[PDB]
Amino acid sequence: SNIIKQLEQEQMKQDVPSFRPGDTVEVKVWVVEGSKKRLQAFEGVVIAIRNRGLHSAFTVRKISNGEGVERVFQTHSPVVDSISVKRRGAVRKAKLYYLRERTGKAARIKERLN
Amino acid sequence: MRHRKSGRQLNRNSSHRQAMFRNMAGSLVRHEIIKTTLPKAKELRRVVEPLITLAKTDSVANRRLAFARTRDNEIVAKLFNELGPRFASRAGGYTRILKCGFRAGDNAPMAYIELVDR
Amino acid sequence: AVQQNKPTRSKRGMRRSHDALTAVTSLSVDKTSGEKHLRHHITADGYYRGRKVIAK
């Protein structure tokens, strides 16, 4: 209700960039190795966005070292330091789960030149 | 468990329910008062009142939407030419249900559902 | 599955102890016509809460 909405608004980030399903984004996240906290970048196509307030999330799919990896980031998590849109993609669906069956030239996404 | 769920199956499949409520909505618009069962009337409210709210604003798009919801141009015309203008100021609740005894054939609880202004 | 012994008239009546019907507690009287009716239902003449609702 108003109570939970207040408790969530006080935790929501205020700078989350606008990204649509199909865009290529780089998410820099905090990884901690023992005693040193550094930033690691995950760049790939946003194949799903779940808009749910503080519980908002987005899935990014990359092909790393010959293997497909998907990472579901909690948008307002303190571990996601930054999100940047490196390329705007032109899709028509909201969930590009069909890319999971496509590889190489078959998985290309046209740029939204607008 | 049906926790926090809406709608009545009414011992029908979904297509049958949709067709029945389309026909019954047309009948209520046409006659302005009909006698049905109490469950069916309490669902006809949720079918019909949104149509009148749609008719409140007259556009080609809204007329086509109303045709899709109620495939009959006489009902669309009445909604957009009389009923909408009539219920313009009313917020909601364009219908009322009056319980009217039990059906002789099956002891079914019966009711009259009518447009409020009628 | 079926009875091994015939149940009695006593047991029959005991089972039917909960089968009795319940009379209507009271009938409401319309403020305008004075006709009696089931509460929250229209009268036979078509009056509910003092207003004729169905013409006949």
Added chain:
Amino acid sequence: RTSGAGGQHVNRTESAVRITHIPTGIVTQCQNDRSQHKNKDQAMKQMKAKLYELEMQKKNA
């Protein structure tokens, strides 16, 4: 219970006998007769014979 057990009796009775020599690891088994006692006798005979042949084989070698 023995295999191909034909009838209520055979399905019910523990007639088949298997004898294992723990040191040797050799096994004999009999389920020819309807009687556990006769089956155990035949299996004991076979166990003695197999231990004999084991030592016979060693000596022949």
Added chain:
Amino acid sequence: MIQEQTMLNVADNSGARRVMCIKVLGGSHRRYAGVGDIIKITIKEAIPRGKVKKGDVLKAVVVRTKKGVRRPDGSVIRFDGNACVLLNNNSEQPIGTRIFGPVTRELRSEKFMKIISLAPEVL
């Protein structure tokens, strides 16, 4: 979520191409193994000159799963296939010398640090 009869790919240069989980080790009635868990595997396909041969029974550590791993903030990392690294049956140290594909931070332990060091990317 690897169980018995699950076929996994191999992420090292040990020479196996396909292995099958025959037991999820470490518990009675333990059902599933996830990233960082040791399983007993049989080699179903191997390259001709590899160190390991088809039909060998050894151990392996699951390094990539389709079910994925869940990070403390609720995030999940999912891979497109189930992959393991074969380990010696006794020492439980990696048999190969190269690791192919990404591995996760869950693998980091004093035991599996060799894999972490030899990995192309630790996600």
Added chain:
Amino acid sequence: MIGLVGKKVGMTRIFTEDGVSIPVTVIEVEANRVTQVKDLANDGYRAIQVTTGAKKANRVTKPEAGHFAKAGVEAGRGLWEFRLAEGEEFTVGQSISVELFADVKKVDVTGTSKGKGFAGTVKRWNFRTQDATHGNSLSHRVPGSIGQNQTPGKVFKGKKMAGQMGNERVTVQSLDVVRVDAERNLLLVKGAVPGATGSDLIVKPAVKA
């Protein structure tokens, strides 16, 4: 120790600076007013009765209204009792706020679990279903055997069978207290507490510790 009666506002998450999402249940613990204090001399045991919230005057019966008026407190949506310890002492009319739990680390939350209705053995007692195919005849989710052949010749008491599941008092013990927001009258506890949103919860200092 005494506890407080609150309401299940819902479930949320708290994001800590070290990248951990704590699942929390938000309990609105309004001021609980003491309507009666029971003692050894008069009642044989030491306890406080508390009320919380508000009620329609037209829905408060005269018998209940007399009790509230004797206390000198406004009517609440119910009355609950808490057994007092040896040192604990309160007075009628005193109000107790969520600040009581400020230094409490773990709490036990009791509520009425969501009601599942007439539930089968598979759902209620985690029975295993029989084979879906391979010849099973009308017995895919049925209980199976319920006893032995003649000895005992009866079904034992407490046999796990189908029946009502849920809508019963359930206590979850040793839940962390994530936050005590006194100004919003909120208690944020880690994990899931019994009951649906809008239900009453009895929150006590943890007994196991």
Added chain:
RNA sequence: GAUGUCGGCUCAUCACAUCCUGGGGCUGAAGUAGGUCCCAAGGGUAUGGCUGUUCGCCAUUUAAAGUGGUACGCGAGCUGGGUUUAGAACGUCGUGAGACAGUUCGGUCCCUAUCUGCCGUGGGCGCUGGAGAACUGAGGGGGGCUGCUCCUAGUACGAGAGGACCGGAGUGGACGCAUCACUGGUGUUCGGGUUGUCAUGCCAAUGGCACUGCCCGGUAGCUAAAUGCGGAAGAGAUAAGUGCUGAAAGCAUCUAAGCACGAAACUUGCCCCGAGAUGAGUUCUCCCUGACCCUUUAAGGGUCCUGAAGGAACGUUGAAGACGACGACGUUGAUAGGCCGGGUGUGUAAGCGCAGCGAUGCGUUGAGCUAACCGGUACUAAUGAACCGUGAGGCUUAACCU
């Protein structure tokens, strides 16, 4: 004048002759690890290959993969591979019909629960004036498992190899309870794509039918694979066992008098039910303070007047629910629908304009639509009534006022 059977499945329950975990004695017990016996039944006590198999062997685990009873538990719970009819064939026996604790291929598993029992859920009356709540706890049930790592400590022990007891912390497996914040499933009540066909006069736009026609997404709810929590600590009395003091029996002696320890077993401690606990308990609060007549004259019956507290009924309903029941609300109202705003999902509606020969693209445009969600809002429906429930509540004896 019929007690259905091997194995499996589902569900078990008890015994202890204990497989693991607990406690101990002796050891041919240095430590680690064992052997053997005693106490202990709280919890726990594999998945596969082969075979109809039980059994068994084998592979790989586990702390362990216990032994048994229960019609070798359980077919009005399931199966039907084996066995057990009728078909057929092989080997063998017989001249033959046929036969085989020989084998081989195929071959109908009914029952709507009356009673007891059990799991749930109501109605009645009782509990001694009626009523609304909160309790107490006689009693009953649940639960009780365990691995690995680290510290102690490479310490004690040991020639080395190896390697502790006691005590502490962390993290798992299996099991159970709850919940849906997250990750997912579902989501024929939301959106979109698309095939065939029919219809809405036609175009455009829609609708119907084809498993929701086929699909792609997805709200609420429900839910696991998701994520919180639990097993305990402590106390009492003990088992085997260990003792102190101590005679009978100038010694000795754990015992005879007296005294102290001693386990997952017992009684508690934790969770739930629980006053039909007829031994029906306790506390708080609320309500009712009229007259008259008869009889067989009493815990008697009437007559009038009075109808309280509260309940029930009815209606709107609910994360409550088979029906009951339980909860919320009924105009002095947010109970349900509608409506309004938001959110969410889908993914840029239609119409119009432009580009293109055209399919189509672009602009208007993150557009349009949007269930169960959230915040509001009396527009619709929750009717004034009526109904049930009474009028101060027995006797005896105490104590106190009197």
Added chain:
RNA sequence: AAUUCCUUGUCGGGUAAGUUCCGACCUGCACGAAUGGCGUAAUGAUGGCCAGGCUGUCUCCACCCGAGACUCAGUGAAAUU
């Protein structure tokens, strides 16, 4: 071996593990030449074994859509005793 009791014979193949299967062996309890012997392409709702694909068959079940079951009105059995 539709034949072999012993017997899950032994050896080889396949499997992590194979009383079944396949290839041999010959010690044929108790094969054998028109109650035919040994082969055999094609064929088979024929028996056994193996693999790929596929999957709620299963780990381990969850949700949804319909018809019953449940409540109300009407009609109204049965075995058994």
Added chain:
RNA sequence: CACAGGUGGUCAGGUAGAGAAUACCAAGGCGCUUGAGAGAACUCGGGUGAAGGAACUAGGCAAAAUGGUGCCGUAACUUC
């Protein structure tokens, strides 16, 4: 039995389709002689399902899967 059974011959529209298959329709005929609610277990008939993929079982039973036309190409063995 106003019973999901059995019963020979004749007629043969449109669109798609090879078709008398199949889907939707025409002419024509019907909604099947108990209804109304609710939306528990369980049974029946379907839909979907994370990760796995025969571990199930006597046995892949059942389900899932494959599925058209044209072209390319196609093994042992063979009675060609």
Added chain:
RNA sequence: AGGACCGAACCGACUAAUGUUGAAAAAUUAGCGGAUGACUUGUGGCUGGGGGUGAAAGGCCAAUCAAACCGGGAGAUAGCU
């Protein structure tokens, strides 16, 4: 050309589920086999009980078959209940 191939009508009936006081004294649903032939079907005829007919199962001969049904011998006989 073909006791040829695929597949409706048509004829059949291999598997499962349902039903088992059934919608049905043998069916329904999803699949399954043949489908120019030793095919299938209408009408009529013929074969009769120790007889018929049987691509053979003791199969079929009016829901009856190791000897049909109806009537008679007949109140067969029953050391049995």
